[PDB]
C-alpha cells in the first residue's frame, strides 16, 4: 500500500521489504494514509 512522511508533504507507496526511510528527506517517521472506504458520522 502507500504511506506518507511526517515532516514533509510526500506520498510514498513503498510496500513491504522497503519501509524506512523517505524519498528526498532522510527521516524515518512514516504515517499510514487514510482509508478509501468512507466512514459515516451521525452528526450528533
Amino acid at each position: 500500500l502507500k504511506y506518507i512522511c511526517a515532516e514533509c508533504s510526500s506520498k510514498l507507496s513503498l510496500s513491504r521489504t522497503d519501509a524506512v526511510r523517505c524519498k528526498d528527506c532522510g527521516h524515518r517517521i512514516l504515517l499510514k494514509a487514510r482509508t478509501k472506504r468512507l466512514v459515516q458520522f451521525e452528526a450528533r
Partner: protein, 49 residues
C-alpha cells in the same frame, strides 16, 4: 501451521476510530508500530465531575 499468532486486539471494553497509524524502524533496526485510536466520549450518567 508454521506460524504462531502475536496479533494485537482492540480493547475489549473500548471502541472508536483508528485516528493515526505510525510505522517506524527502531534504534536496533526493528520495524515497530504505534496505532492511535480516537473515541469521542459524551457525558453520561455516572461520569465524575
Amino acid at each position: 501451521h508454521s506460524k504462531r499468532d502475536a496479533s494485537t486486539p482492540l480493547r475489549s471494553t473500548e471502541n472508536g476510530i483508528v485516528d493515526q497509524v505510525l510505522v517506524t524502524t527502531n534504534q536496533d533496526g526493528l520495524k515497530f508500530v504505534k496505532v492511535r485510536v480516537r473515541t469521542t466520549k459524551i457525558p453520561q450518567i455516572g461520569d465524575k465531575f
